[PDB]
Design a binder for this molecule. Sequence first.
Ligand code: CNC
Length: 255
Amino acid sequence: PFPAERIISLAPHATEIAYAAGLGDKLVAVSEYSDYPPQALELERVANHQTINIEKILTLKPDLIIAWPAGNPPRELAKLRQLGFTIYDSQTKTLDEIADNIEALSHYSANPEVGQKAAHDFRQRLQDLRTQYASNQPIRYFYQLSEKPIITLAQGHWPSEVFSLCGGVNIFADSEVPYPQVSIEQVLVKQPQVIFTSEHAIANGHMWRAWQAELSAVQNDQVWALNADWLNRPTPRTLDAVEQVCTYLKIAQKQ
Ligand code: CNC
């Protein structure tokens, strides 16, 4: 396509993949929470979970925008397309798509070998992890994005695929929306073998201690925090989430 000179990222994960793809030096704006690699804190922000700042983007004249269709507002992305910007749509469902993203984005780099290498390395480590964590048996898990309200994941949407590599089975897989709000009772009824939550919830005392009697996951000491930066952004660091998730689901075979 062409070595881009003024690149904008509309998502935290997209900023990580941009740096891995050898584009980081050409970024001129990123999203809120684009905090990795940490120098990205230095760049101006043009997007958050509710709004893309199209005025500022006009002001910046990007020759490449790295979009996150799954998380960005559809109307504003459509506007950017209608305005004639060159846009790469980052797809964010599978683990192999992370490497695909990096390899695609490397086409816009002045040094495509960087992204070529990063994708190669990702693919090899992903292969290593698939081999290493095959022995895991199916475990039914609950993954909490928040305690108030309880939001979880469903329909195979990200990060469902991280868990599935390890044999993990989402208790809310068959929900009518991809990120459903669920009640305490809904979880309690479902009887997850493992509960995954945030480091914050653990540190403060997690909400499921009160429910030890009704939750085998609590009796068995299988409520664990996951690193949300690794897990919920599809990036090279997702392979550390794979390790973390897979190690915990391995432990969960103890009974
Ligand atoms: C579900 C959800 C939520 N998420 Co996320 C979490 N946890 N998230 C997700 C999942 C979305 C899946 C998808 N989009 O395909 C999921 C797990 C992948 C995700 C991921 C992230 N999220 C992140 C954050 C910080 C946030 N998330 C919230 C938006 C946060 C929400 C908190 C809340 N209670 O509202 C949340 C709990 C529910 C939003 C929703 O469903 N609204 C209903 C829907 C109809 O409204 P909506 O406006 O269309 O929602 C869309 C956006 O929120 C967008 N989106 C979701 N998260 C982000 C984060 C950013 C930076 C941006 C720009 C857009 C989003 O995706 C939604 C559609 O699926 C947030 C308000 C939580 C909080 N209170 O801190 C917050 C801050 C947003 C901000 N200031 O811009 C991450 C950076 C977390 C991390 N530690 O890495 C990460 C970024 C992903 C990436 N690609 O870079």
